[PDB]
Design a protein around this nucleic acid. Structure first.
Ligand SMILES: N[C@@H](Cc1c[nH]c2ccccc12)C(=O)O
Ligand SMILES: N[C@@H](Cc1c[nH]c2ccccc12)C(=O)O
Lengths: 373, 373
RNA sequence: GACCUCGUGGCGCAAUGGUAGCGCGUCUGACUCCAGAUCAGAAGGUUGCGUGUUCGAAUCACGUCGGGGUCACCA
RNA sequence: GACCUCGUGGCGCAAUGGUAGCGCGUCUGACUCCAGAUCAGAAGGUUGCGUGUUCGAAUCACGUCGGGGUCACCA
């Protein structure tokens, strides 16, 4: 697989150890999410400060985002939201969700309308995760920028403090890139500062922000944490997640363009079954006999990784890990287990997504005061 | 002085000749402004198309701007506004005025509040020029960006179509510059496209824009005219003005930082007199005798240039030019003439500026439908 | 996060025993119808801060703030 | 505005008489508990457009659209 620990050291973040997980527990009076228990969210930045502040009755809000690449969203896009939804319940803090429709516009061969529409469409799947209408504000960059008295002002503050060389270094842009991409980083940094949401944080500028996200988003936030001090703001705390494995393997890349690259949120029970059996990479031995003797390799087995993300029952997961690893369970039954887990899951999502009306999306996307300001 | 014709050829613009001036006359049933008659506004881009459209009952709006460097504005900052105010009367079109408070923020050692305040303050002097409350919208970038459904969208369209190398070339930025300056050009291009003012141009995207401005602003608009086609919009037409001379000479640079660099809009009758006599560069001969024989040089004489901008009476101006040039009038009386012209002028401005209430500024700066949409 | 580099008289820049210079400026007097050139002089908060090392420090160390640059192509 | 450069099979790239290649992919069959490696083959809108120059053109000229680059430091 990939060296997450070496990644941690490389970037400079911190490993989420037991003391931290226990702290989260002690701080929420609730069992830490399996993503934490199982290592899915393994890295962090300043989480203890978040915890210290929280335990000391000081506010903090969650900030996470989504790049509306298309109307197609797969099971892997949900991880950070599934986690953030949990975080919101467990800490009871307000949440801000950024739809970078303007980023996709700058990057994909998309039109502002398509981009925006994708933002709005994805918002349905995000909302379907169960976020609290009263304490979460989903917003598209294209919309919010033009209707906020604090957001642009921060983008500008942030931009006066980030040179091209910096982004060139952090993101690897080039003089050949459009000035849109060159400065986009500030747009993603901006929601890390509460006064970008005047209508919800009462012009306050010191509310602690916690950004749960996939490890590959860290560069934006390392840059953010870097300008924050320079512009009189606190730096956002982070909770990093690992990469969701593509069906072809942890190494390989997945995308809404290749349908057999992952289980998409629209897939049917049948497609769920087909995709796993016909595409989930395996760690199981070639012949059913070699497997029995050597046991399967759960480290590279995409189906087990999947279960690791969605089989909530700790004990059940272990049975599988144990029997698969020993050879007692052939990768065929493993994949069979993953399908009985995914089918009811994707179904449920499609269900609650449908219950998301236009007025509900409209609300979520409307800037307003939020329950716990 | 400076080679404006060579500038015209360099840039690629067009010289405003008699046929054009006469066209403007024939098109407005009114005598073309002295800035046109005397060469102050000497260059243009597509003015005939503006005229063709206008004469053919097709709409066009004016767009001009101001960089709120400070609360201090001198007589030279007024030229493009004095002209634009005339253009508005004479063509009866709506006008849009951009206060680039975010540009000064990025460039000067200013704070967002100072920047914004300067924008609002300058708006008073601009408004004092007599623009029509019903057909002109003065706006600060810092404000409008956060309260417009079309402006940011265009900045983004414009940014996806302008590479760093381009601006590097056009403005000479460097990898060392902040991403804020790198992409600022799009912000100044954006008001060249009517749909940036949805609340006034009814989401229309083909209304002809005419940008009166100082020749040194052309680079922004050459870049604009360049992306316009690529993003399905018409390119802005231009009317270029020459540089207002600094008191130390046409060559030398002037700035709100050096008070004796020009006559400021707040100056007193006495200061007007003092500054001219004690600082206006001259083209008059050394000794009062050499002057009589050789006559003065009106080409480099800052005081005459001044009269050229503010002595509206064509005949009177000629008398001065004639007598000064022959030696009949010593530069002392010339400067005396310029002072009797400037004093009542600056006074009048200070007068009508005072009549500009906060509610009047507030109105001008409020995005709304405009008389002639 | 780490490291590197710079941080000056109003701005742009200079490694002690004589006169620490003005690119550029400001200011006063003279000459000129005026402005400028010129000539004659005058003035301006010196070292980002905080400790410390030496007989002495802007020139050294530590810490700190700020500008800039830099770290397994890429979000 | 001018000039330069590129523009391909789903993407990344190649200057005719034999077999226009696959970096990479897609797809079918076989073998495997499944996925992958492997083996065996199948398919995909070829030249951004529009004219034109030659017996023939993706390889030339003109025009055009689009990506990129470039022109008296600087708005
Ligand atoms: N760029 C992210 C979107 C995003 C914007 N802001 C964020 C903050 C946290 C995590 C992700 C985001 C994506 O492509 O999905
Ligand atoms: N940059 C210009 C301000 C400006 C913005 N948009 C404009 C359009 C036309 C002329 C000037 C402007 C200045 O410094 O004064």
């Amino acid at each position: 697989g990939i060296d997450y620990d070496k990644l941690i050291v490389r970037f400079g973040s911190s490993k989420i150890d037991k003391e931290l997980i226990n702290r989260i527990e002690r701080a929420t009076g609730q069992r830490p999410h399996h993503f934490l228990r199982r290592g899915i969210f393994f890295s962090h930045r300043d989480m203890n400060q978040v915890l210290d502040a929280y335990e000391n009755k000081k506010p903090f809000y969650l900030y996470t985002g989504r790049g509306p690449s298309s109307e197609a969203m797969h099971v892997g896009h949900l991880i950070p939201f599934i986690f953030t939804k949990w975080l919101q319940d467990v800490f009871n803090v307000p949440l801000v969700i950024q739809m970078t429709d303007d980023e996709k516009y700058l990057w994909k061969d998309l039109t502002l309308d398509q981009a925006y529409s994708y933002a709005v469409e994805n918002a349905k799947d995000i909302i379907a995760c169960g976020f609290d209408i009263n304490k979460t504000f989903i917003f598209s960059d294209l919309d919010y920028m033009g209707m906020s008295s604090g957001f642009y002002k921060n983008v500008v503050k942030i931009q006066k403090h980030v040179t091209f060389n910096q982004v060139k270094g952090i993101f690897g842009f080039t003089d050949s890139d459009c000035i849109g991409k060159i400065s986009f980083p500030a747009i993603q940094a901006a929601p890390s500062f509460s006064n970008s949401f005047p209508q919800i944080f009462r012009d306050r500028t010191d509310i602690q922000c916690l950004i749960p996200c996939a490890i590959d988003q860290d560069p934006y936030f390392r840059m953010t944490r870097d300008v924050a001090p320079r512009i009189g703001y606190p730096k956002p705390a982070l909770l990093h997640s690992t990469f969701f494995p593509a069906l072809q393997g942890a190494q390989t890349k997945m995308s809404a363009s290749d349908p057999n690259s992952s289980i998409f949120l629209t897939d049917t029970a049948k497609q769920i079954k087909t995709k796993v059996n016909k595409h989930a990479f395996s760690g199981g031995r070639d012949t059913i006999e070699e497997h029995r003797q050597f046991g399967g390799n759960c480290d590279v087995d995409v189906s087990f990784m999947y279960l690791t993300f969605f089989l909530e029952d700790d004990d059940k997961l272990e049975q599988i890990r144990k029997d698969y690893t020993s050879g007692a369970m052939l990768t065929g039954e493993l994949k069979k287990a993953l399908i009985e887990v995914l089918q009811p899951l994707i179904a449920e999502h499609q269900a609650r997504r449908k219950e998301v009306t236009d007025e509900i999306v409209k609300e979520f996307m409307t800037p307003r005061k939020l329950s716990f300001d």
